[PDB]
């Protein structure tokens, strides 16, 4: 024969001793408080207040500013007859080219 071994323990059903089980623990008071901790700090705190936080981020990565600033510049250069954008990012007077 083979060695001295414990047999396979049968798989427990948490609903047998506790039909009101939330599946967190076999102690029902610990089970209910684990459920309340998960649901309050997960849904009531992180999800709700976190989605509210993300919804009211103060102009995340200055997009709104960038529209408003663009609405300045267009309005400056529509009126002064300038082109809306130059092809040159940098002034060609402040660039030395390698001569050839």
């Amino acid at each position: 024969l083979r060695w001295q071994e414990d047999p396979e323990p049968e798989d427990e059903n948490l609903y047998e001793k506790n039909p009101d089980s939330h599946g967190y623990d076999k102690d029902p008071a610990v089970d209910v408080w684990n459920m309340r901790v998960v649901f309050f700090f997960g849904f009531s705190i992180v999800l709700v207040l976190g989605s509210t936080f993300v919804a009211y981020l103060p102009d995340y990565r200055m997009q709104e500013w960038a529209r408003r600033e663009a609405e300045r510049l267009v309005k400056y250069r529509e009126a002064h007859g300038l082109p809306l954008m130059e092809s040159n990012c940098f002034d060609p007077s402040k660039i030395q080219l390698p001569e050839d």
Binding site: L1, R2, W3, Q4, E5, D6
Partner: protein
């Protein structure tokens, strides 16, 4: 520790306390030889410390509260189930024999520690030198396998070599018929299931293997059932022995210092009883090992080192 190299350097030699009465005496015999009182009688005439025969729960008596532990924590084996079902499937026979060899090894270490630390001799009953005569008596009865004998001989080969033999070996001649008469008068319902061939094999490995090999390394005294009843003749024979054999003669302070350093470290004594030889009678798998270990730690006085258990009333732990 209490004894170490420093105490040996600072003067504690064991030949200062090694007097003439400092004798390790092992009393041997068959299952109802009646040696158990004889040993005690010798220990009350020569003034020696008597150790009772190491059973399954000897280590339980030396550790913790001294009370026997449940059988799943110490032994995992039954003598009564060996008497009931000797050829059992679960491997109780060799597991019982291996646990008893480890218990007698621990007892022989305790006996040598008492002898080398106090200078008082010790009377033992069936030491590690005579344990094998049950093993072969099981193997000749088909109770254990050849692989179990090989495992036993490996453990004995690397454990008994570290110790000194007894000074005196007392053997009690009791025939198998008188053994069975005393078994039937004992009244133990399991012990009355012992066959005649098993007792005869015990006597054969006693007289043909054990006593011839102990006649060279020590002094064998051999008595019948009625002349062992007089303790004064046995003590008179012990007191007039001329000790001239065995390795006790060439023991200086250094060798006995090394032996005392061995026999006070009980994990080093019990090191090779758990050698990784995966024999099915003694192999415990990991789930049962884990479960029984964690149940052992939850016993009172067993979670921590002995001076460190608040549940049994240990104080000043924050300063220890």
């Amino acid at each position: 520790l209490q004894y170490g190299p420093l105490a040996y350097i600072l003067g504690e030699k064991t030949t200062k306390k090694m007097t003439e009465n400092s004798k390790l005496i092992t009393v041997d015999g068959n299952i109802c030889s009646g040696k158990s009182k004889l040993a005690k009688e010798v220990a009350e005439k020569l003034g020696l410390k008597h150790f009772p025969e190491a059973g399954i729960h000897y280590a339980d008596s030396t550790t913790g509260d001294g009370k026997p532990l449940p059988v799943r924590f110490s032994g995992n084996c039954s003598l009564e189930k060996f008497y009931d079902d000797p050829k059992s499937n679960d491997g109780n026979s060799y597991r019982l024999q291996a646990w008893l060899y480890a218990s007698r090894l621990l007892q022989y270490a305790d006996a040598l520690e008492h002898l080398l630390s106090t200078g008082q001799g010790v009377v033992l009953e069936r030491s590690i030198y005579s344990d094998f005569v049950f093993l072969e008596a099981m193997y000749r009865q088909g109770f254990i396998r050849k692989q179990c004998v090989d495992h036993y001989n490996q453990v004995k080969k690397v454990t008994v070599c570290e110790y000194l033999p007894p000074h005196v070996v007392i053997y009690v001649d009791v025939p198998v018929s008188e053994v069975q008469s005393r078994i039937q008068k004992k009244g133990n319902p399991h012990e009355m299931k012992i066959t005649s061939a098993y007792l005869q094999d015990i006597e054969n490995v006693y007289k043909g293997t054990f006593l011839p090999e102990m006649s060279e390394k020590c002094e064998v005294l051999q008595y019948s059932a009625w002349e062992a009843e007089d303790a004064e003749k046995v003590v008179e024979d012990i007191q007039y022995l001329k000790y001239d054999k065995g390795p006790w003669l060439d023991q200086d302070d250094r060798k006995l210092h090394n032996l005392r350093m061995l026999v006070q470290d009980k994990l080093e004594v019990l090191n090779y009883t758990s050698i990784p030889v995966f024999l099915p009678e003694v192999t415990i798998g990991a789930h049962q090992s884990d479960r029984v270990f964690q149940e052992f730690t939850e016993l009172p006085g067993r979670k921590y080192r002995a001076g460190y258990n608040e549940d049994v009333g240990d104080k000043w732990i924050w300063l220890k």
